[PDB]
């Protein structure tokens, strides 16, 4: 019985951590996609030079 | 220049309060939520 | 645990609000320096006249 | 440099996620087998009581 | 025995991490029918035995 | 002396006990006073010029 | 609330032998998850369009 | 502005995974570079008018 | 003059489309790879059951 | 007029250089992940006995190889185009500078 | 008694490293940054004990 | 025995949704 208790402690902690990590991954990839595809053109950074 | 000194005090106070409260939230989360999880049977050794 | 939760909640609200005010305050300071050098140049040329 | 570094970080995080799921699956399987022997003990208890 | 071996190989080459050992342009791998049968057939074979 | 006095400032964030008098602050007020008298002497030279 | 629902499923996994039924409550929990996902999609879309007009 | 939005967005994060690495370091580098560019530009525009 | 500007337009448009194609293709590949991984996992589960 | 155009053309030429560099780095990035597919089928093709199985993994792995090859050929296609553009821009550059002189 | 001792040492190290961060940010005093400013008046305080 | 364990588990999972009562507040009056 005691071993059982240890087992489900393990699995609950594991899966909550997995949820956290999934959230973080989706966050970072979406936000940086959005921002990186914005970057101006080297010609405009020159500024019609 | 008088206005500038006033704003200087404002900025300093704000930043220090930021640091303090960040410490508070930090400590509370990773300490309490570490053991206090689901089902009050098994120790957090 | 119920009370512990709302404790954290109000802390988070405080975090967000204070960060916003900080941003706009530093913006205003950034503008006031420009005003300062404006007045200094004015002093110079009036002295020349 | 910004773009390259951020991509590296995302890669490492993916690796960690994969290992986590790997642990989870076999954890569940062993849980099931543990239960099965747990029942076996009850049967054996009766078998010895008779 | 054969099924346990199959599970072991599937595991150890699924969890087999990328960027570790499999650096090889294996090719000619678009063709293979060493597979001889169907999941329905394997289920019915196990059922026959039981 | 801008950098000097701001260098002095945030020393007054220190928590309860380790906040302490040190040779730093003594030397700091020394340098403050001496840079002040420096500036006024240079102003004197300006008037003479 | 997503985390709470996940934890509730986790505790529900603790049931025993013949007392593990497809209680329709669990179907409602699945639809809970999917509702959360749809809400998240709507939020992120609106944020994107705001950014473009900015 | 893009850099500021990135910094704030990455700041918003869940507790058990928030770190300090090259990513934030490089963001701060880019921001300081931006501000120095601004200051130098305005100085140059001044000599231009003179 | 006009030949210059025409060449400029050509170059810009093709560069833009190239970059967009590159991006979308990369995301497609890693989604479908994730799908494959999930499938293999469920197969392992079934094997353990038997 | 002419010197203005010449300056902006220099800008564009080194932009095109950056384009080709990103193209080749994308190729080198795609270079690895195919390692999974071929060696995946390598590990699975040998199996002790009858469990040799056509299943969800097999179809998807074939799709992996097929789509990856598609990607690779498209990318080298854009490599040819970017080289074409580079040389054309270069010849325009040479012309412009000579009549400027 | 043991627990009391550990608690005291914990408190001490916490405040000590807080001062440590304050003073490292301090020693990061090299010239030409924005936080430096004018707030003159810090030369009379019975502050630290 | 098994039935009692089931009941206790049900009450346990029931109680936690006081969390979902916002930060233990009213929001709307």
Instruction: Give the N-to-C terminal Cα separation of chain A.
Output: 77 Å
- Listing every helix as H and every strand as E from the N terminus to the C terminus, the arrangement of chain A reads HH
Q: How many beta-strand elements of chain B?
A: 0
Approximate shape of chain A? rod-shaped
Give the topology string of chain B: H per helix, E per strand: H
PDB class: structural protein
Keywords: microtubules, axoneme, sperm, filament, structural protein
Entry title: In situ structure of axonemal doublet microtubules in mouse sperm with 16-nm repeat
Chains A, D, H: Tektin-4
Tell me what you see in this structure.
This is part of a larger assembly, with three copies of chain A, four copies of chain B, three copies of chain E and two copies of chain G. With 49 residues, chain A is mainly α. Chain A is built from two helices and no strands. By secondary structure, chain B is an all-alpha fold. Helices cover 76% and strands 0% of the residues of chain B. By secondary structure, chain E is mainly α. Chain E is 48% helix and 0% strand. The radius of gyration of chain E is 15 Å and the shape is flat. Chain G is an all-alpha fold. Helix content of chain G is 76%, strand content 0%. Chain G contains two helices and no strands. Chain G is elongated. At the I-J interface, helix 1 of I face helix 1 and helix 3 of J. Chain F: Belongs to the tektin family. Chain F: It is found in: Cytoplasm, Cytoskeleton, Cilium axoneme; Cytoplasm, Cytoskeleton, Flagellum axoneme; Cytoplasmic vesicle, Secretory vesicle, Acrosome outer membrane. Chain F: It comes from Mus musculus (Mouse).
Summarize the structure.
The structure is cut from a larger assembly and holds three copies of chain A, four copies of chain B, three copies of chain E and two copies of chain G. With 45 residues, chain B is mainly alpha-helical.
Identify the notable features of this structure and list them briefly.
part of a larger assembly, 12 chains, B: mainly alpha, G: 54 residues, 2 helices, 0% strand, Tektin-3 (chain F), Tektin-2 (chain G)
Please give the structural blueprint:
This is part of a larger assembly, with 3 copies of chain A, 4 copies of chain B, 3 copies of chain E and 2 copies of chain G.
Chain A: H1 2-36, H2 42-46
Chain E: H1 2-14, H2 39-49
Chain G: H1 2-12, H2 24-53
Protein name (chain D): Tektin-4
Subunit structure (chain D): Microtubule inner protein component of sperm flagellar doublet microtubules.
Coiled coil (chain D): 24-50
